[PDB]
Design a protein around this ligand. Structure first.
Ligand SMILES: Nc1ncnc2c1ncn2[C@@H]1O[C@H](COP(=O)(O)OP(=O)(O)O)[C@@H](O)[C@H]1O
Lengths: 68, 95, 237, 247, 186, 169, 69, 226
């Protein structure tokens, strides 16, 4: 929201999928991912930009189903 | 040698000791006319003089948000709640 | 220490041995996809065959546990075969003790209980193989379940396991969120395109082995080369 | 491979058993006082969270036999199994001899099982010490205290809880044998419990007490309910007020 | 600090009845409604100028004043004779009760005497602040600009220097001196 | 046995559709035995729905406040604290709708004092938002900003209140 | 002579005041606690007078032993 | 060694780690009302791929004994299977007592094979039990090492502390009717991150008529008007 709706982000981008990662991703990484909407091929940001932002600089940690 | 002279130990303060520490720490501060500091200290289970200091400063901070010179018994009991937040967390109670 | 060496609870309040055993499934270099459909349930895994001196006839990772339940294994092949043998024994023993055939959910529950006994105690170790078993169940339609080296047995509609399981699960989540039921053409094509998008080799109809259980046709059909080739031709059309 | 510690010390000490016995002092608080025509136990209710319902009707005091009752002060996991084994031993004796089991024999059996647990195998010592009050044909009212070391002792006024030293000092100061009766024993027990529990004016809910009395050829083990306990508290409070004011 | 505020109201009502003769019908009504209450006989030497010399409540009202003042005087005599409480003791608040009786009931002269007495007696921070506040309030009551200036001078000079977060409780009436005077500009 | 309350809901729906006021008021004053015979939450929400439907269309400004105050007093007599708190929040909203100056403010303050000791969240967010709204109506910008910031701090709890999130934004 | 300025002697940042970079409530971290931090700003937010009279001793140091989170 | 073990001087370190593990993240609140008991829990499945009618968090051990749990679901399965076998054995031995609440205390006590024989690694699940075949309800909690606690209202999730605080502040109380399930859902709401729905929230109720796991229809009905 700081960058007004990620500089006019599209509707079909919601963070519900790329936030419920349980992969740390400190607020600094969150700000970096927000600024990784710098893909200026278009004037709007899509869910692909967020997916690439989460894909870069990340460590694979998963498997909560055993604990639950 | 260097320790065989004495081995004096510190008993944790009793309810009346916690009284006396409440009186020592609250003589400097201002509060309401009426307060049952004896029951206030007894309400705290065990604890120590550091916890009495924590209760006194918690009462001061609680009275700060209301901005009055007379710390009320309700604010004191809110300060007694500083003895809480430790408890035993989960009811282990295994003994 | 030995918190991370034996099956004991960590001081932080975790179980590291099973956490490692799950990554053991990713080890081995394989992926599998399971898609439940409107009426059928189809599963497909790649068939990584290094050199042709092997017998592609017997390199498979999918098996018939009983006449209506088919499993696909992911992870170390020795533990995979051990758990397949255990599942077949459980299915036969259930059919002997109780007249009706063992429901797939009950079979997955028993396998998960065995795995939970394995993660219990300290003499043995958990088996590094995650099993996805499917089968048609009356009054339930197709049914898909996953038992893991921990003992948590669940999984439905679209579920994947292997190295690149997360990407496949994401694509299948997109597909299932797209509200349209898959017939006995769309379910297979969806699974095939999911695994192909995960690992783009365009899937020459020899490197995957698909198992199918429909409702009008029961039994675990291990679809032949001709059937997978026909489905691939229809999809890439 | 990991191996347990059921071994000695370079000096020759069983420091695992010693640590367990000291840990028994930590957590829990029970005391038994023996008097003529009645023996009683007093227990400190540790957790008094308002969200409980108190339906087990007893947590520390356990009825173990027709003619006896115990009170644990160790880890509840071992306490439950130890109470079950104690009841089983008592009832096995009752089956074998068709006669209530003498208290000393029961305590010796239990301490034998605890000595076995600390003696052989890679098994933890039973981290629990419990009192016993009971009546028999040979010795009448008896009180026994057994520690996790398995070395029981035949007491007449003792405490086993956290401030067990303070409680036993208070008992020694204000204990009088022979003259002691059931009512004066109740007064002494409530007084020592008030001493060992820092909060004065103890609520009847935080204290659980059970008295064993000898009716006409029959042993009655009555746990004193809330109203009777708080009436005892009121009588004690009257005594305290009179004694303090008369100076 | 609530006392002397309803006194301020009656002082303003006396102003409205006295200075503007246009308000000579409703002003009489409000003056009477707030003077038959509040025990206005000692604070009626000022009220006699506008209305009659004394309203028709003389017997009952004077009996109430004398009885109340005598009871407080008896209480003060007991504290100052039977008990030797000195300095930091309850005699300080006993004389505050004396001053409150002499102010809210009696005339300003006895209240001022009791105030100046305990001001010279005890110089504690809280006691000194309270009495300075009372002196300011009674001064702005009876329109003694000399007393208002005196208490304002001492408060702003030394009294408010010792003790904080109470100047915020006092400037609203400490600047009333400028408010009542011409200096309403800066 | 619950078909009667279904009929009450059905009657209230038709009264709202037609626009009736006196009949709906009489029904609300009549259903009180049935309210004190069922689940507290279900009866409370039925009362809230009926009251909101009554206050929707027919603008009897001299009767709406009095009727709802009577309902609050009735709820207090029935010791339904969460019901009476909900109607207090509703009258804070109605007060803001009718441009009430400060009686809305102290009612909101009373609600906040009663509710912060509890741990309700939806009511707190609505109360704080209404307090921000009336500060803005009275042009109390800094206190509105402080109340709105507290509204955000409280509103973090509810994850998908699709109406409420739009109200905050 | 004595040089008045002290900050730029070794740089090490300077007066970051009088400049809104990230105001306050605009932070995404909400609180974490932020109540001990508002407690820490009580001394800058005047209240040194209220530190006395009431008798409290306001904190002087605040150490935050957290990761870049 | 091969039992509940690892007890140093004055501590049960392995048990304490098991309790750190049962902190979990499934709140699984329980409320003992006058008419009966409500055990409500949160089923927050990862993604929509998983199913909610496939696996359950609430299990009816017998006719009117219901069970909810905490972290380590695989352990909870074995524990509930053992509990079912134990209750069935008791009912077979003492034939036809319709044993639920005169058995709820007994089944809670026989939850000693639960932990007092830990099995090298102790169980990592704490479970709440409800029964109402005595004319009165019963809510008990068994933890990875302790025993019956006989709660009136509690939670065993990631935010169980503030959940229990909510329960006491909202006055679990004693006159509350059977429909304190609204308060249980509210307590879950505090420890819930999302728009909870019928499949997202699983709740079972045990009243004097028996025990029943509420279907998504009634769960959604209760979740409506909240
Ligand atoms: N609203 C926000 N909430 C939390 N963190 C933010 C916000 N906006 C920016 N940040 C990030 O916080 C980071 C601060 O990191 P840094 O100062 O390096 O950590 P540390 O203080 O531990 O060294 C910045 O890099 C910035 O990207």
């Amino acid at each position: 929201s700081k960058m007004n709706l990620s500089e006019e982000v599209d509707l079909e981008d919601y963070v519900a999928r790329p936030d419920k990662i349980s992969g740390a991703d400190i607020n600094s990484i969150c700000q970096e991912s927000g600024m990784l909407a710098v893909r200026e091929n278009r004037y709007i940001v899509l869910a692909k930009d967020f997916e690439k932002a989460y894909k870069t600089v990340i460590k694979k940690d998963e498997q909560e189903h055993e604990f639950y | 040698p260097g320790r065989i002279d004495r081995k004096i130990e510190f008993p944790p303060p009793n309810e009346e000791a916690r009284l006396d520490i409440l009186k020592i720490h609250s003589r400097k501060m201002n509060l309401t006319r009426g307060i049952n500091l004896r029951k206030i200290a007894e309400l705290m289970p065990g604890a120590s003089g550091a916890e009495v200091k924590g209760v006194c400063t918690e009462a001061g901070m609680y009275a700060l948000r209301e901005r009055r010179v007379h710390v009320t018994q309700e604010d004191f009991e809110m300060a007694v709640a500083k003895v809480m937040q430790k408890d035993s967390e989960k009811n282990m109670s295994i003994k | 220490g030995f918190d991370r060496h034996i099956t004991i609870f960590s001081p932080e309040g975790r179980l590291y041995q099973v956490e490692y055993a799950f990554k053991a499934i990713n080890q081995g270099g394989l992926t599998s996809v399971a898609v439940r459909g409107k009426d059928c349930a189809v599963i497909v895994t790649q068939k990584k065959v290094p050199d042709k001196l092997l017998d592609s006839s017997t390199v498979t990772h999918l098996f018939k546990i009983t006449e209506n339940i088919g499993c696909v294994m992911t992870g170390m092949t020795a533990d995979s075969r051990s758990q397949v043998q255990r599942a077949r024994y459980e299915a036969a023993n259930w059919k002997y003790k109780y007249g009706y055939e063992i429901p797939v959910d009950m079979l997955c529950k028993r396998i998960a209980d065995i795995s939970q006994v394995y993660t219990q105690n300290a003499e043995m170790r958990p088996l590094g193989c995650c099993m996805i078993l499917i089968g048609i169940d009356e009054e339930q339609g197709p049914q898909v379940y996953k038992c893991d080296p921990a003992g948590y047995y669940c999984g439905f509609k679209a579920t994947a396991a292997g190295v690149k399981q997360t990407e496949s699960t994401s694509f299948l989540e997109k597909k299932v969120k797209k509200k349209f039921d898959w017939t006995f053409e769309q379910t297979v094509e969806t699974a095939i395109t999911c695994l192909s998008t995960v690992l783009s080799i365009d899937f020459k109809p020899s490197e995957i082995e698909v198992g199918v259980v429909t409702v009008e046709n029961p039994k675990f059909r291990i679809l032949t080369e001709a059937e997978i080739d026909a489905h691939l031709v229809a999809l890439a059309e | 491979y990991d191996s347990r510690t059921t071994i000695f010390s370079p000096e020759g000490r069983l420091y695992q058993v010693e640590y367990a016995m000291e840990a028994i002092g930590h957590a829990g608080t029970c005391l038994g006082i023996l008097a003529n025509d009645g023996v009683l136990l007093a227990a400190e209710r540790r957790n008094i969270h308002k969200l409980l319902d108190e339906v087990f009707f007893s947590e520390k005091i356990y009825k173990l036999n027709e003619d006896m009752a115990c009170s644990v002060a160790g880890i509840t996991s071992d306490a439950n199994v130890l109470t079950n084994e104690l009841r089983l031993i008592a009832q096995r004796y009752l089956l074998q001899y068709q006669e209530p089991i003498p208290c000393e024999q029961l305590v010796t059996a239990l301490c034998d099982i605890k000595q076995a647990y600390t003696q052989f195998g890679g098994k933890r010592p039973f981290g629990v010490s419990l009192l016993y009050i009971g009546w028999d044909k040979h010795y009448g009212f008896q009180l026994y205290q057994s520690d996790p070391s398995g070395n029981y002792g035949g007491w007449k006024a003792t405490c086993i809880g956290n401030n067990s030293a303070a409680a036993v000092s208070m008992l020694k100061q204000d204990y009088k044998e022979g003259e002691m009766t059931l009512k004066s024993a109740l007064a002494l027990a409530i007084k020592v419990l008030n001493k060992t529990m820092d909060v004065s004016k103890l609520s009847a809910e935080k204290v659980e007490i059970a008295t064993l009395t000898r009716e006409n050829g029959k042993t009655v083990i009555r746990v004193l309910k809330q109203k009777e306990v708080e009436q005892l508290i009121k009588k004690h409070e009257e005594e305290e007020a009179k004694a303090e004011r008369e100076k | 600090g609530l006392p002397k505020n309803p006194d301020l109201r009656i002082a303003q009502l006396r102003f409205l009845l006295s200075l503007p003769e246009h308000r000579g019908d409703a002003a009489v009504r409000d003056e009477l409604m707030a003077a038959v209450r509040d025990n206005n006989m000692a604070p009626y030497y000022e009220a006699l100028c506008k209305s009659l010399d004394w309203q028709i409540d003389v017997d009952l009202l004077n009996k109430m004043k004398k009885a109340n003042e005598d009871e407080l005087k008896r209480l003060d005599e007991e504290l100052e004779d039977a008990e030797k409480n000195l300095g930091e003791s309850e005699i300080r608040d006993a004389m505050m009760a004396k001053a409150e009786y002499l102010c809210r009931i009696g005339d300003k002269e006895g209240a001022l005497t009791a105030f100046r007495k305990t001001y010279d007696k005890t110089v504690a921070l809280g006691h000194r602040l309270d009495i300075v506040f009372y002196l300011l309030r009674i001064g702005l009551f009876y329109m003694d600009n000399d007393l208002i200036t005196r208490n304002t001078e001492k408060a702003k000079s030394l009294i408010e220097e010792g003790g904080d977060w109470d100047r915020r409780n006092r400037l609203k009436v400490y600047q009333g001196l400028y408010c009542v005077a011409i200096r309403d500009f800066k | 046995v619950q078909v009667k309350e279904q009929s009450i809901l059905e009657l209230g729906s038709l009264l709202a559709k037609t626009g009736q006021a006196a009949e709906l008021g009489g029904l609300l004053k009549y259903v009180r035995p049935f309210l004190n015979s069922i689940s507290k939450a279900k009866a409370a929400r039925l009362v809230r729905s009926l009251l909101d439907l009554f206050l929707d269309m027919e603008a009897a400004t001299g009767q709406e406040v009095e009727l709802c105050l009577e309902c609050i007093e009735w709820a207090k007599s029935e010791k339904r604290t969460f019901l009476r708190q909900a109607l207090e929040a509703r009258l804070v909203s109605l007060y803001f709708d009718t441009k009430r100056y400060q009686e809305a403010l102290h009612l909101g303050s009373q609600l906040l004092r009663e509710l912060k000791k509890m741990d309700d969240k939806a009511l707190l967010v609505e109360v704080q938002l209404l307090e921000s709204k009336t500060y803005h109506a009275l042009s109390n910008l800094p206190k509105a900003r402080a109340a709105l910031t507290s509204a955000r701090t409280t509103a973090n709890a509810i994850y998908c209140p699709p109406k409420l999130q739009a109200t905050l934004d | 002579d004595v040089l008045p300025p002290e900050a730029d002697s070794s740089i090490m940042m300077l007066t970051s005041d009088q400049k809104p970079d990230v105001m306050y409530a605009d932070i995404g971290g909400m609180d974490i606690q932020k109540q001990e931090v508002r407690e820490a700003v009580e001394l800058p937010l005047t209240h040194f007078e209220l530190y006395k009279q009431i008798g409290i001793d306001p904190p002087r140091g605040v150490l935050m032993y957290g990761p870049p989170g | 060694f091969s039992l509940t073990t690892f007890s140093p001087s004055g501590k049960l370190v392995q048990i304490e780690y098991a309790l750190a593990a049962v902190a979990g993240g499934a709140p699984s609140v329980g409320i003992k009302a006058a008419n009966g008991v409500v055990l409500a829990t949160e089923k927050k499945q990862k993604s929509i791929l998983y199913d909610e009618r496939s696996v359950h968090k609430v299990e009816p051990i017998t006719k009117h004994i219901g069970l909810v749990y905490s972290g380590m679901g695989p352990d909870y399965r074995v524990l509930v299977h053992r509990a079912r076998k134990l209750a069935q054995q008791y009912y077979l031995v003492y034939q036809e007592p319709i044993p639920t609440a005169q058995l709820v205390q007994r089944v809670a006590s026989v939850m000693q094979e639960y932990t007092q024989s830990g099995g090298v690694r102790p169980f990592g699940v704490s479970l709440l039990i409800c029964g109402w075949n005595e004319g009165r309800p019963y809510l008990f909690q068994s933890d990875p090492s302790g025993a019956y606690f006989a709660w009136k209202a509690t939670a065993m999730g990631k935010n169980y502390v503030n959940g229990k605080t909510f329960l006491e502040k909202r006055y679990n109380e004693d006159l509350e009717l059977e429909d304190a399930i609204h308060t249980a859902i509210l307590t879950l709401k505090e420890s819930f991150e999302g728009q909870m729905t019928e499949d997202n929230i699983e709740v079972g109720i045990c009243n004097e008529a028996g025990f029943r796991r509420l279907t998504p229809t009634e769960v959604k009905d209760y979740l409506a008007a909240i």
